[PDB]
Amino acid sequence: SGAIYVGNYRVVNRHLATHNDWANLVWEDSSRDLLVSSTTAQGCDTIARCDCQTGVYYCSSRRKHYPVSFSKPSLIFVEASEYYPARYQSHLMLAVGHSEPGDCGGILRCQHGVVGIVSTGGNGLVGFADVRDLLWLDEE
Numbered sequence: 001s002g003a004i005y006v007g008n009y010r011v012v013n014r015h016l017a018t019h020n021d022w023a024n025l026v027w028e029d030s031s032r033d034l035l036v037s038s039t040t041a042q043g044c045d046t047i048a049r050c051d052c053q054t055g056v057y058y059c060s061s062r063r064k065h066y067p068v069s070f071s072k073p074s075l076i077f078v079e080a081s082e083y084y085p086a087r088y089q090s091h092l093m094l095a096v097g098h099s100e101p102g103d104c105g106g107i108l109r110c111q112h113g114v115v116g117i118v119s120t121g122g123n124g125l126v127g128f129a130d131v132r133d134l135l136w137l138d139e140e
């Protein structure tokens with residue numbers, strides 16, 4: 001579990017969105033595993049606007065933040081899970097690191113701010129849904 005709180009927005013994995021998230025929906029995209037809802041209080045996270053390929057992510061299954069090297073956002077095949085059928089997920093970055101299903105939502109960050117959230121994994125890999133292209137998270 002986990003979310004990004006920037007401005008009056010809450011960014012979560014689409015597959016983990018609550019009924020309150022859907023009832024206050026701003027934008028969702030199943031191909032990216034992302035959903036954004038509106039919030040009453042202002043959040044403290046800042047979004048990175050950069051092309052870093054190194055950063056640090058939070059792994060809840062280890063209670064630890066790990067430094068990682070990650071690939072550029074791409075279209076990657078993701079196997080069938082209890083949340084989606086086998087499909088191509090877009091804007092996904094891969095890294096070598098520990099992950100378990102419940103680790104989804106952990107933040108990946110660089111020196112500039114939040115880069116994305118854990119979305120996929122398995123066998124010593126972890127995948128992150130990038131958010132750096134969503135410029136509208138910084139306004140309105």
Ligand SMILES: CSc1ccncc1NS(=O)(=O)N1CCC[C@H](C(N)=O)C1
Pocket residue numbers: 015033078079080081082083084089099100101102103104118119120121122123
């Ligand atoms: C951190 S997710 C994870 C980690 C380790 N083993 C396995 C997994 N699970 S998964 O990769 O099948 N995942 C399950 C939840 C939905 C995800 C999606 N974005 O399509 C796919």
Ligand SMILES: [Zn+2]
Pocket residue numbers: 048049050051052110111112113
């Ligand atoms: Zn950066």
